[PDB]
Design a protein around this nucleic acid. Structure first.
Lengths: 49, 78, 64
RNA sequence: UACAAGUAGUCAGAGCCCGUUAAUGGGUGAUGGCGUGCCUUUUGUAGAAUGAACCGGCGAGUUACGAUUUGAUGCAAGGUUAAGCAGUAAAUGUGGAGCCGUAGCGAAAGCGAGUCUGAAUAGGGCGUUUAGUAUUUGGUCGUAGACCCGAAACCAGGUGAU
RNA sequence: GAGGGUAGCGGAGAAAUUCCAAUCGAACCUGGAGAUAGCUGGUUCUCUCCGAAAUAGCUUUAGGGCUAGCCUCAAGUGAUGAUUAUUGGAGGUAGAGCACUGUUUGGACGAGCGAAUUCAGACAAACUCCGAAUGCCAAUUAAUUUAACUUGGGAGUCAGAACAUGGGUGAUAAGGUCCGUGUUCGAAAGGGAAACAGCCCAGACCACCAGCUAAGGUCCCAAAAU
RNA sequence: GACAAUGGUAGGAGAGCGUUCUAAGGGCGUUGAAGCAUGAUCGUAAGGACAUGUGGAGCGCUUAGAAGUGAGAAUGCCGGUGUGAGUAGCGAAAGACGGGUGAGAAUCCCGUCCACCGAUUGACUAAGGUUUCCAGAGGAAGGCUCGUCCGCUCUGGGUUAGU
RNA sequence: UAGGCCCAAGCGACUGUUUAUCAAAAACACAGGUCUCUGCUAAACCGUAAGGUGAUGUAUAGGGGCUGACGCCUGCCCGGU
RNA sequence: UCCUAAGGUAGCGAAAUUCCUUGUCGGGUAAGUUCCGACCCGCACGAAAGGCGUAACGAUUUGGGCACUGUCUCAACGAGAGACUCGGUGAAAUCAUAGUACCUGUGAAGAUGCAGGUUACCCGCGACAGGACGGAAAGACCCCGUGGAGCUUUACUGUAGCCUGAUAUUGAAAUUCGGCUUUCUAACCCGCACCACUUAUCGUGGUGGGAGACAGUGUCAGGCGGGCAGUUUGACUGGGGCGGUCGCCUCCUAAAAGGUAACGGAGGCGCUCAAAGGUUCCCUCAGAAUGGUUGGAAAUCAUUCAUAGAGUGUAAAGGCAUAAGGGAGCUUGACUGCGAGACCUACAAGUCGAGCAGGGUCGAAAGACGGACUUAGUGAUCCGGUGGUUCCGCAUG
């Protein structure tokens, strides 16, 4: 906006903060594991490959 | 010279928000008023400010509360 | 070059799953003796940015 | 063409002079009807509101990097390269750091097809569509002078008492 | 007369904002620099379909913006749209009336009695014992018709005018000014009103030396009845 | 075939004309290319051909690609040419005649008369200008007219210090 | 070739200066008056450093403000600045 | 008699000053808003931004006389230069194209070009100036722009300079209570003298005098500071200025749904209540007449009529006698987490709400209670303060 009345992002308050030590995990579902044959070992070294 | 008038207030929007014989839900506003101009009938309540709302689902009927008196009712039709 | 992001807007909204924006409420900073109990209970629930305002500030938050 | 009141044309039309990209042809015009230039700006202009003497040349939405949307094409729970190396300043191989999507909710710890609020999914909010991704034609926006021409002014460094 | 000095955030002035190279309320040249301009002007080829607005809110705002209304293109849902015919309903305008609050005319009523009581006759946007014609909301009801709604790309508009009608203001003045409701112009050529945007009739795809009509007309200009 | 629709400012959407360059394919041209002029020709529009004159060496056609791609207006910029119009003016002032030169004479040379300044229109010199000074030739341009003339053109010359 | 004169009034005493190019005046200046600062590396001013003017002067001398020949004079108020 | 620091002295006065005003009287002229002399009722003279006078002076401003005259009654004639005809040479402003009449109308409201009528054969030359809203100058007057520049001040924020204190350069001795004051010389200073570099006192060095831990200079702090610099100084408005207004609530205008303007017509609000809230019981007003120690037959005693004319905390409207009006008992629901649906609406906001769960008050019970008969009593964000908390907290606690 320019001039005029107060902008929308000026009449609303700020909310929350952010965490420096935030951890994010890569999620793998059960259905995605059907590719590997039964009776085999699954390792993070194998899911990436 | 000058003047001493010119002030006013924003117009409040009262009246009948529902028509006679119209299906309404369980919280619809039927009438907005100051004081009592239309009395609550069956399945009709009253608010803080004098307003009429339905309690159940059905048609809206405006009836006669004797002489020079009025009421609105809601009947559980279908 | 690269388009810049409104830093003030990034401190007030968050993007939902369907691309909408989740905002907070106003009129809650002080002067709480001049408001009814029902008013203050219902001012603690978050809202969504309206479609009219969305058409105006969509370019401001493009990397968010 | 020297009795005539004209935005100068158009429609109708005798008379006179010629003969074509050969077609129900060309040049001129005694008379009759209709008819107050063009552009800009305005509620409204023949306007006595602005602009142009005339002719010729030059004279104004473009490019780079990002965002979104539409169409085309390749692959598909996957899609795809960057800098660098080789190669003709060459269009092609290598290069998987990286980026988007496949899962959301919460200020956060955190939980997870379910999360937050809440004593209590008791109710309510946002999710469970769980098909995208790389390039490119067109439309629009942002950062750069950003469609073009036009100030009264400000700052810095110098030149002047013929 | 000749040779010299004082330089612009500065000099000189027996003082006028006077002079400093025909220029001075702050000299000239070159750079920042294509300064900024919510302001005037200009913006180059041709055809087909559709087609506005001059409004509300906010605004250091009033000849500028933003959101909403109205226009256009594409993809979606599928009677949800408009007009009539029959019932139901909310809402006190025109008119009328004096039962309330106020105004007022003339007679009986001593407590001065045209109003402390009574009988007749009048007035009112901020009076009502009463109360239309229209307009408005619905039915899940019947004939006719063709539109409505949602999500996305792109806009323009925020100076309006006249006429008819209900009002305020003015002076029952204005081609005056501000509101409600329609038509036209705006953005509409053709015919009538002598000429004359808004009045009356009527909405131009192109061509013809064909016919019937509207508004207004038929003695001559000038087509039609002396 | 049958029906229905097609006035339009701001503005939205679609199909097209023309100019310059590039790739590929295929053509024309000294028995005459582009450009220029005329014509009574063709398509719904922007526009496309053919013939004849001039011209003297390059240029179209088809499909794609790219853009410094289209002009009547901005008191627009540059060049050319009109109207005012044979109109205003030709910058203080006294000339007349005879003889020559000459293609050409009111305006050039020679002689006579008249006229004007004379505390200056006379004689020197400082600043400033830099060859405008002299002789012999010339008449395009300069001279607010003419010119055989010139502070104008050509060719040659000219400034001498112990005070 | 070579002064027109006279009688009254307002302003400024006078001789002088000023808006080159629409104002020459009652406007500025002026001799005189008054107040105030300055004891000398003086006060005042430029540069705000050196170095200079004042001044190669010394309170009968310098800078600044206001009035403006000459004659008669110049009253009251120290709350406010 | 009131107030103040005291209330204008001497002089002058329809004045370079007097709106009313051409004030009143006298003089001057046949006739005098101008001129001179007096009066004082000085809108609004006044004593060094001086008062009252004054010989001489002035291309200064005013009023009246003599002489003179073409300044006029009232114009006429003559000379020269331009103008006019011929020969030579030869521009400019302006310009949409032009075969360019008048009257009455019409029109963006003042026509060569539009309607009706009336006049007028084609082309030149010398003259005049009514129109072509005639030609040069993008109106300096008025208004607008969140445009410039110069100037002022007790507008705001700064600053050049100036004043004051602490500290370093900065030493050495003594007095009553970490210091004040008084002495001394080596630091430092002298546009103070003599000597040398040097025929120069600019400079440097040396020798004598003066002042002296003072002054001058560096860093930090307080005060004065239009001398100077950068900016601000609102909008609506029957042009602008002046006056008035700006947010909220209740009526009329407003055309019986909702909405609807004007510097149109009327009023309020920026609170209050600890019971003036909730629940359970009980009750019905104002006014009029009559009677008795007569104050308004209405200051209280008593009777009758009396559907509202009374009350409802505060303006108005809509309501309320099933009371929402008056009285009494108990009590704190003027609670916590929510909330299907709906009204209004550009957004941000605003309004009502049945029901679910956790504590409860009153009532025998069904039930009522999330402030007051309803509608005004209110201000986004940023920043800061206080109380609580499974939250985070930059290698680790």
């Amino acid at each position: 906006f320019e001039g005029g009345q107060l902008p929308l992002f000026r009449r609303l308050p700020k909310r929350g903060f952010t965490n420096i030590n935030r951890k994010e995990y890569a999620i793998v579902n059960l259905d995605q594991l059907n590719k590997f044959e039964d009776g085999t070992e699954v390792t993070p070294a194998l899911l990436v490959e | 010279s000058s003047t001493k008038n010119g002030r006013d207030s924003e117009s409040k929007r009262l009246g009948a928000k529902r028509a006679d014989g119209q299906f309404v839900t369980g919280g619809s506003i039927l009438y907005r008023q100051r004081g009592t101009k239309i009395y609550p009938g069956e399945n009709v309540g009253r608010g803080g400010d004098d307003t009429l709302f339905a309690k159940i689902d059905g048609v809206v009927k405006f009836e006669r509360k004797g002489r020079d008196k009025k009421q609105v009712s809601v009947y559980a039709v279908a | 070059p690269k388009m810049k992001t409104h830093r003030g807007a990034a401190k007030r909204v968050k993007r939902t799953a369907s691309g909408q924006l989740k905002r907070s409420r106003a009129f809650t900073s002080h002067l709480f003796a001049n408001k009814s109990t029902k008013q203050k209970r219902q001012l603690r629930k978050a809202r969504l940015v309206s479609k009219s305002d969305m058409k105006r500030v969509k370019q401001l938050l493009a990397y968010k």
